[PDB]
Paper text:
While DmpX proteins of R. pomeroyi DSS-3 and Pelagibacter sp. HTCC7211 did not yield crystals, a DmpX homologue from MRG strain Roseovarius nubinhibens ISM, RnDmpX, sharing 58% amino acid identity with R. pomeroyi DSS-3 DmpX, yielded good quality crystals when co-crystallization with DMSP was conducted. The recombinant RnDmpX also presented a high binding affinity for DMSP, with a Kd of 474 nM, and the crystal structure of RnDmpX in complex with DMSP was solved. RnDmpX comprises two domains connected by two hinge regions (Val106-Gly111 and Arg244-Val247), with a DMSP molecule bound between the two domains. The binding pocket of RnDmpX is composed of Trp35, Thr64 and Trp84 from domain I, and Glu113, Trp152, Ala153, Tyr200 and Trp202 from domain II. Residues Thr64 and Ala153 participate in binding DMSP through hydrogen bonds with the carboxyl group of DMSP. Glu113 also participates in binding DMSP through a water-mediated hydrogen bond with DMSP. The side chains of the four tryptophan residues form a hydrophobic cage to accommodate the tertiary sulfonium group of DMSP. In particular, we found that Tyr200 could form a hydrogen bond with the positive-charged sulfur of DMSP. When Tyr200 was mutated to Ala or Phe, the binding affinities of RnDmpX for DMSP were abolished, suggesting that this interaction plays an important role in DMSP binding. Thus, the hydrogen bond formed between Tyr200 and DMSP may represent a novel substrate binding and recognition pattern of SBPs.
Numbering used by the authors: 24 to 322
Write the structure that this text describes.
Amino acid sequence: ECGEVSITEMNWASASVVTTVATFLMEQGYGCAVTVVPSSTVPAVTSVSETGEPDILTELWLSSLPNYAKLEAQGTVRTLTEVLSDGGQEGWWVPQYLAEAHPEVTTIEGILANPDLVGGRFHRSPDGWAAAIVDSSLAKAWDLEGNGIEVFAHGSGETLATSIAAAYADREPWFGYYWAPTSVLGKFPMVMVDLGEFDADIHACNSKADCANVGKSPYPRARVITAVTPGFAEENPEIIEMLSNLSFTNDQMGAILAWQEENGASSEEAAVWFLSNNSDIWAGWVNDAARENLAALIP
Ligand SMILES: C[SH](C)CCC(=O)O
């Protein structure tokens, strides 16, 4: 049967839905005993590399983890599936109204030459995200500070998101890291600053704390996966099979997030809502036994 299971909950909205839906399916469907570990990309990958826990890492954004392939080779982790099946795109953004009022902010060089247009500030992703390493590398490669752009490190994904909302309310400038599709970007039309042509080797270097030779590249489009420890896999073929199926298209994730905001729903309430209304999506994720358990508890 299924006993003790630990799973990361990453510190942003889609990630919460992912972990909450997974938890519910594991507990109700397979009688799992699930410990949700609040986490972030960097300490989470660090934690499995060192303690072989937690069992399940998700969402795992692969855009800026250049050493993940190696981790999987050494058999420290195993990729089950892309949990956001459409993927996502990270970048540096300004509000649409700003890009329309002053089109020169649509390229990084344009911004660097006229920092007042963005209020002399860049909003950096928070400590614990792989993106914080990249942004920090890019700030250096473009010499933001030297050009009068202050790199402001947000304390969390929440305060990063709120700084957009605040700026937007008053139609003020904003320049910083974010990603799409997200609720924030659906609610506040943003435009991606052109950071030049993608370069795999430059980005790999930007993604590594120890690579000093930083260069200019935008982020690649992200694959976003659920991963597990081969130990947990060996032990729980049924959960692995289920987690190999558990996945959301961006439309599906959007539809859940919206519902959770139009109500005051907890993450748990959103999960129940998704499962209750989307049998056609998830029925195939679970096995017959689990589906018996779920059929009986869900309504
Ligand atoms: C929230 S994500 C879009 C990226 C996560 C990370 O950079 O560690």
